[PDB]
Amino acid sequence: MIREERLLKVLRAPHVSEKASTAMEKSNTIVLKVAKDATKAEIKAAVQKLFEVEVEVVNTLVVKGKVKRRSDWKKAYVTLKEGQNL
Amino acid sequence: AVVKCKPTSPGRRHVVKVVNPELHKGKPFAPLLEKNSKSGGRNNNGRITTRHIGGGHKQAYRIVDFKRNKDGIPAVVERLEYDPNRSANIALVLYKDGERRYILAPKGLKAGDQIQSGVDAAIKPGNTLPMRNIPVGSTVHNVEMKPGKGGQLARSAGTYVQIVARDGAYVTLRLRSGEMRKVEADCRATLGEVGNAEHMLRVLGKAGAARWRGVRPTVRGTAMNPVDHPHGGGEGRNFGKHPVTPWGVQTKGKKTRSNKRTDKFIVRRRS
Amino acid sequence: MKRTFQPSVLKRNRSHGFRARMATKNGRQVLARRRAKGRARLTVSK
RNA sequence: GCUCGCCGGAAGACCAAGGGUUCCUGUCCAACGUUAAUCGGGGCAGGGUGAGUCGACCCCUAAGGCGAGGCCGAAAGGCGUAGUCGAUGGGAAACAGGUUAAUAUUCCUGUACUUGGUGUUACUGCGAAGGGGGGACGGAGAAGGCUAUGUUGGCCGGGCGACGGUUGUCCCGGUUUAAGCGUGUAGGCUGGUUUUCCAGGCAAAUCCGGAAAAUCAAGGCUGAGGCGUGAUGACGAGGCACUACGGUGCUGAAGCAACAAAUGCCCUGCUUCCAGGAAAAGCCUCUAAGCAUCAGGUAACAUCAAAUCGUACCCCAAACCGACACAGGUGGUCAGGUAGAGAAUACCAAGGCGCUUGAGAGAACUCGGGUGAAGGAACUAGGCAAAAUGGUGCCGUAACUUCGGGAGAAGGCACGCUGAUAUGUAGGUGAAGCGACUUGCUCGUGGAGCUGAAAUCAGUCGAAGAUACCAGCUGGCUGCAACUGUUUAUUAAAAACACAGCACUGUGCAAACACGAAAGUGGACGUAUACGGUGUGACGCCUGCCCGGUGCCGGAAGGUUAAUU
RNA sequence: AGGACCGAACCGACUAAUGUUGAAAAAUUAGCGGAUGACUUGUGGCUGGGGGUGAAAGGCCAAUCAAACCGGGAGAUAGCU
């Protein structure tokens, strides 16, 4: 089991964009910023618990930092089964 | 059989092949093979320690029984094989107990023949015996120097040794160089001469033929600059000096043997 | 024409990287020198 | 937007390496961009890289590195055993459609597949750091069987012609379909099955190796492609709407056959050759210590797990390497048509471009071309440069020679189109049918169709028929080096170097010799038909004389002679 | 069969012109040579300065070579300018 604290740490923010929206309304998938070391499993469990929704699968990609000073962050494609989240 | 190639092109005009119909045409016996990576003449420091080596065809080492230890078990010759690693060529022998090994192929040996090692084997080619048991005047090959060590002498293509005398624990051998050497009579030997005596009749015919034996070109000393070789420069072809190695030791006559540990065994230095 | 610098990250790290410097005392002295001078980029290792 | 030019085995597409956000979108025009710029790889802001199956990581190893102890060496350190790393190599598995402004074998849709764990049930000998198989291998060449792919017919949808003609031996487009699963064939290879026994594989084994005996030899492995299914699916020429004029939605006909086919596959095959062609793991089998109504194994079935990381973009280039948006360099993969032997070349297709200064004029002179009357090397250091020759078939061909050459020697001649032979021939491919059978991915026979040279004869055209591009100038006499090769990156490609061969000399193995204060290592896992050094330089005919000197080799009677005492 | 032959890719580099403040710190253009080999190329490795490596040219060793580069001795020394 992944304990409560890590779940409270792995979800940073919901990623909002045209891709993120269209993903929500077509694939029923939500896009999140997650802790850079979060795992498919950790994101899955955290979403299921903290959002009380049911998830099919998680796809993750690390977005490389843009010159400025942007830090590398991980983007998560969370595919819900049927619950409406937000 | 030595065969001349017809001169359909330069580089074939002078080739003389040594073709042997009895050599096995398949692959060798895989249980007696090891990888044998080339060196280029470099030692573990990475420096060339022997010049003119490198390139050449890839070769797998065949494990050859030089010791001939299985005493009293007769063995039959299965086939004769090309061996890239010797000038001689080898024979796969099967022992009646189910073991196979490679030996140097004696002169007349051929597939189906029976060989045997021991103290009681018969005096005939291919049989390995301690030199106590071999008649004086015999022609042997693959001779040992220290008992149980393995054959080291007379082991190239057409070579052999004559057991000249037996005086106590030592036999006097006429090595192929013309040297009389004493060796303990407990050292083993094989009757006969090493086969493939025609090996020396081949003519490579072209530079590439040498290159694919791994032999790289030799630049003459006198063709270099003075900083490169003692046979230095000159305007034109100049020599004017006593010939030497690249390291300045007089070649053409000067004698380099300096071993007093084994001088006791040299009955007569070659000539 | 072919110029002298033909980059290769593997070869770079093997030839001048941090652990290659640390392998021998002479490399560790290179590192000590570069710290003493205060180099921002201590080796090629990126 | 319409034309026109250019590339097209690339200047198209796709990657690796390298780079690093250049990607896509909106704004902007200071600087940057060799000009202007409203544009941009520029500035600024926002987005974009989704994986059990692709790669990395990972299991395993090569060259090599490092290396517990160890052996060495003033120290620092060197080498190296057990080991441990290290790909450029070997180890499990996904494909087709659709999608975004930018990601797709990753998303979605359809159809799959792999490897473990965990249960449950059945049935059981399981179990190594060990053994034996396997992995697992060269070069050349020659088929055959195929496929990608093309071409043509048929089919289906549309057309009826800006100018004579054009309801047809007309015109134009489409005619696509995968992993997987079933099947097992053109090939390729080996006989098989029991029984007994053992001087082998550390020991030992039922595995493998050997030796017998019997009985069948007709048994098994492997392998493209085809075919069926996947798939009543998807796609599809087109319409038909709507519209931001970008584009989006909706519907959808035919979807076959023949021939010609790769450098791709069968094939790591086969044949030949000498130069004799990795390694280890996964894998499969055997047991050992052990475990023993257990554990494990094996099969079915269910369940779960397959993390992490790379994924944008450029990538023969304005994103890499060259200070530059530099005429240079840069590994792999794919590669259509018509001519053509071709990946040459000409022109094109898909696709991509027109090279980030332009507008005039139409001087000398410069550069890069074209053409020249009469001459024809008179030029010049020298035919430098230019011009010339060029293809295929066939005829013909000298001295000389090491018999292979020389030799495309030299020199000729026939090339187009049309018609006939023969409404297309020789040949290739091959349906129906017809029989057979050990009856289907069958064999024989038979030939529809399809493709299709080369010739001969006759006729015709232009000045000319290898009509372009493309594509040998040739002969004679000599020097030198035999030759193919190699070199002064960036003024010398040679007669130099190398070479096969030849000789001389060292060298008995702990070899000589080299690199190392050493340990060691190469030589060499080689053994005098072997290795090193040296001179010459294929081959033919040959290599005379001289040992004074100087080296080297052998002797040392005698003289002399060091430390030492 | 062949260090066979002709000829693309590929690898070279004989000749001529141009360029010489270049498009380029050695290229371009027209020809040229080899093109199954003593070949060519990718990726890694290995050899180090009196040292390597060299089919040998004093060639090559990061546009540097009769002794690399970098830092130190070192403000070497300079009857010379």
In angstroms, the CA of B89 and the C1' of D50 are apart by 64
**How far lies B232's CA from each of B236, C11, C41, in Å?**
11, 40, 51
Backbone angles phi, psi at B32, to 5 degrees: -115, 40
β-bridge mates for residue B215, sequence order: B53
Q: Are strands B128-130 and B151-153 parallel, antiparallel or unpaired?
A: unpaired
The secondary element (H helix, E strand) that includes residue B91 is: strand B90-95
For B267, the token pair is 């009955």
Backbone angles phi, psi at A35, to 5 degrees: -60, 140
Cβ count within 10 A of residue A83 = 12
In angstroms, the CA of A29 and the C1' of D242 are apart by 31
Q: What is the DSSP letter of A72?
A: P
For A50, the token pair is 């903290």
Nearest nt (C1') from B262 Cα:
D508
Tell me which amino acid residue B7 is.
Answer: P
Backbone angles phi, psi at C42, to 5 degrees: -75, -40
Domain residue ranges of chain B, discontinuous segments joined by +: 1-113, 117-194, 195-271
**How far lies B8's CA from each of B11, B207, B209, in Å?**
9, 17, 16
Domain residue ranges of chain C, discontinuous segments joined by +: 1-46
Domain residue ranges of chain A, discontinuous segments joined by +: 1-86
CA pair distance A85, A30, nearest whole angstrom: 9
CATH class of B195-271: few secondary structures
The secondary element (H helix, E strand) that includes residue C31 is: helix C25-37
Detail the protein residues whose CB sits closer than 7 A to any atom belonging to strand E.
Answer: B 8-12, 42, 45-48, 51, 54-55, 206-209, 211-212, 216-217, 219, 223-229, 233; C 1, 3-6, 8, 10-11, 14-15
CA pair distance B63, B138, nearest whole angstrom: 27
Helix, strand, or coil (residue B234): coil
Which positions of strand E lie within 7 Å of protein CB atoms? 1-4, 24, 26-27, 37-39, 43-48, 52-58, 62-63, 66-67
For A62, the token pair is 């690390």
Helix, strand, or coil (residue B199): helix
In angstroms, the CA of C8 and the C1' of D85 are apart by 21
- By residue count, chain B amounts to 271
Cβ contacts of residue B64 below 8 Å, gap of 6+?
B83, B86, B90, B101, B102, B103, B104
CB B194 within 8 A of CB B155: yes
| CA distance between the termini of chain C | 29
CB B202 within 8 A of CB B19: no
For C27, the token pair is 């490399």
In angstroms, the CA of B21 and the C1' of D146 are apart by 38
Q: Whose structure tokens read 């090629």?
A: C44
Our measurement of the distance from residue B241's CA atom to the centroid of its chain's CA atoms, rounded to an integer in Å, reads: 35
CATH class of B1-113: mainly beta
Nearest nt (C1') from B11 Cα:
E3
Which positions of strand D lie within 7 Å of protein CB atoms? 17-21, 45-52, 62-66, 76-80, 87, 100-102, 106-108, 132-134, 136, 198-201, 209-211, 273-279, 306-311, 320-322, 328-330, 402-404, 482-484, 490, 496-501, 504-516, 520-539, 550-554
Neighbours of chain B (3+ CB pairs under 8 A): none
In angstroms, the CA of B85 and the C1' of E39 are apart by 25
Cα torsion through A30, A35, A37, A40, rounded to 10: -20
For B246, the token pair is 């690249």
- Closest CA to the C1' of D538: that residue is B14
CA pair distance A48, A25, nearest whole angstrom: 19
CA pair distance B170, A53, nearest whole angstrom: 96
CA pair distance C6, B13, nearest whole angstrom: 46
CA pair distance B184, B147, nearest whole angstrom: 7
Helix, strand, or coil (residue A27): helix
Question: How many C-alpha atoms does B261 have within 13 Å on its Cβ side?
Answer: 1
In angstroms, the CA of B137 and the C1' of D151 are apart by 84
Cβ contacts of residue B63 below 8 Å, gap of 6+?
B32, B33, B34, B101, B102
Backbone angles phi, psi at B117, to 5 degrees: -120, 155
Nearest nt (C1') from B58 Cα:
D277
| CA distance between the termini of chain B | 31
- Which approach determined this entry? cryo-EM
Burial B153-171 (b: 16+ CB within 10 A, else e): bbbbbbbbbbbeeeeeebb
CB A85 within 8 A of CB A30: yes
For B238, the token pair is 């100049």
Helix, strand, or coil (residue A42): helix
CA pair distance A80, B193, nearest whole angstrom: 85
CA pair distance B5, B18, nearest whole angstrom: 11
β-bridge mates for residue B4, sequence order: B16
Q: Whose structure tokens read 């077509």?
A: A26
Q: Give the torsion sign (CA, B240, B246, B251, B256).
A: positive
CA pair distance B193, B200, nearest whole angstrom: 15
Helix, strand, or coil (residue A55): strand
Burial B208-245 (b: 16+ CB within 10 A, else e): eebbeebbeeeeebbeeeeeebbbbeeeeeeeeeeebe
Our measurement of the distance from residue B154's CA atom to the centroid of its chain's CA atoms, rounded to an integer in Å, reads: 7
